[PDB]
Ligand binder design. Structure first.
Ligand SMILES: CO/N=C(\C(=O)N[C@@H]1C(=O)N2C(C(=O)O)=C(CSc3nc(=O)c(=O)[nH]n3C)CS[C@H]12)c1csc(N)n1
Length: 265
């Protein structure tokens, strides 16, 4: 009945819903439109932070990066206060994940591929995880403005949920580096009304949101249950048929998260 419930969500919210839950030894593969392309939006900041962690030692997180206020071309709540202080790489990893700081990710792309090779290097790191489907072609602010049907700056629920299963549950990131990535998204202050809102209180949730034009609202997440069985949940949606200013529906992802909680009892 999962398909009949997920299509009702699309009928009631006027949007396209895509979900993917990787199979386990116990659970099966919960998939709805999981192989169609949705915009990354801010969801790419979580594997971009891990890209900085893999390519650099822990001593690199304390490197002072000096940016200007003219480098602030995107919604960047944390980089707005440290215009003259600069910020260490570990602090921009905190901003790009916990607060989805746009300027953080932009200079995070610079530290990875240089002034003009950041998006290609972030895409190459996803290839190193086995993800040959996702692609990042624009930086902030343009990666959230691509027209519907455009393949640029897109991933799939299947692709990004597989990637996060290697980031949080896999052995792509070493223990100590994995511990700070798991701590960063578990401190996130952007996804309270999304996947968290769909799973009960004694279920542990760690997530990274994404929101953009054409009613885009995403939230990639790994959920933990009271017994401890881990699950990766990827809820991506958009409301293309409403214009660039179509309002995203945060209750949509919560409802989809309630449905995947009902099959994970
Ligand atoms: C050019 O960039 N345009 C953006 C944009 O910066 N997108 C990013 C993205 O995915 N972001 C996220 C997030 O973490 O998910 C969000 C959504 S989370 C959120 N935080 C708050 O503090 C709050 O009061 N309300 N909400 C909803 C902010 S924008 C950034 C945008 C956002 S909505 C829209 N029409 N455009």
């Amino acid at each position: 009945d999962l398909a009949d419930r997920f299509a009702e969500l699309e009928r009631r919210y006027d949007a396209r819903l895509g979900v993917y839950v990787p199979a386990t030894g116990t659970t099966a593969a919960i998939e709805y439109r999981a192989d169609e392309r949705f915009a990354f939006c801010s969801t790419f900041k979580a594997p971009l932070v891990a890209a900085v962690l893999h390519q650099n030692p822990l001593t690199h997180l304390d490197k002072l990066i000096t940016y200007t206020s003219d480098d602030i071309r995107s919604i960047s709540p944390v980089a707005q206060q440290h215009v003259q202080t600069g910020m260490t790489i570990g602090q921009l990893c905190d901003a790009a994940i916990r607060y989805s700081d746009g300027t953080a990710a932009n200079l995070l792309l610079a530290d990875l591929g240089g002034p003009g090779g950041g998006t290609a290097a972030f895409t190459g790191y996803l290839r190193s995880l086995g993800d040959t489907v996702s692609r990042l072609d624009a930086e902030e602010p343009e990666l959230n403005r691509d027209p519907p049907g455009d393949e640029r700056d897109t991933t799939t629920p299947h692709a990004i949920a597989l990637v996060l299963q290697q980031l949080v549950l896999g052995n792509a990131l070493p223990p100590d580096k994995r511990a700070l990535l798991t701590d960063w998204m578990a401190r996130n202050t952007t996804g309270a009304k999304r996947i968290r809102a769909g799973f009960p209180a004694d279920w542990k949730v760690i997530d990274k949101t994404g929101t953009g034009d054409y009613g885009r609202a995403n939230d990639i997440a790994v959920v933990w249950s009271p017994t401890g069985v881990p699950y990766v949940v990827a809820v991506m949606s958009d409301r293309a048929g409403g214009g660039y200013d179509a309002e995203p529906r945060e209750a949509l992802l919560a409802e989809a998260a309630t449905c995947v909680a009902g099959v994970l009892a």
